[PDB]
Amino acid sequence: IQMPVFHTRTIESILEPVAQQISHLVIMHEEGEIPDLTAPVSAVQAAVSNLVRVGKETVQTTEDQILKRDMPPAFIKVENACTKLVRAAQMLQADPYSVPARDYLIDGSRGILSGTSDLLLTFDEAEVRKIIRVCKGILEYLTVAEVVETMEDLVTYTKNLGPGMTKMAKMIDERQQELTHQEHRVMLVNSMNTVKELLPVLISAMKIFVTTKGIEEALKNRNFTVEKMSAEINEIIRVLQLTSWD
């Protein structure tokens, strides 16, 4: 049963060469048939130790409570993986033909891969939550557009909404370029393009409403623009959270 495609291009670039080399090793094990592996194992231990260290600093100094809960079990997984690598090297010094040593090199390798994957994904989910909080900020501020009655309110509204929109567009653009799923990139870009092209429509609509206060047409055109922008933003929030069983 096939291993899924990695979630983003960054994670892919880091983990794919590992995943492939392990597959090669497994094939060697199942098919056909040795220097002292004590030093390169120690190098892996060192690397993993440093990773866990940086991970702990990230955990202690973050404000994402979900990230605090989900990341630390990845530390345990990779440290446990290193243990198997250490045992494998020790076994091989005793017997270069050791089969359990081979199973350990494979299991330990997979453990590091699986754990490094968990750590990367859990951080990626935290990065996504930041984008979502911004998007939901826009949604909340789109509802207060129905409160703007005076021209000075409109000036204050636009000055607050404007930079919020620009930030959201930058985040979505940066995020779409990282996805390994093309349909998701398309849905994100199409939705964001619609939102940006409805922004001047929304501003002009309530400008008419403010000045006219034919208010009925301007009233409804404003509302319809809001609810359409909101619909598009909600669509973005969903696509951002997509790991397809959907």
Binding site: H24, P35, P40, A47, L85
Partner: peptide, 28 residues
């Protein structure tokens, strides 16, 4: 820009590098 992200990616790459070196030494 996102230095917290960069630091994590760098550490994971260092883990990748050491593991690949280990596996390469074994596979020849």
């Amino acid at each position: 820009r996102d230095d917290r992200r960069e630091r994590i990616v760098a550490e994971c790459n260092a883990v990748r590098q050491a593991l690949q070196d280990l596996l390469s030494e074994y596979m020849g």
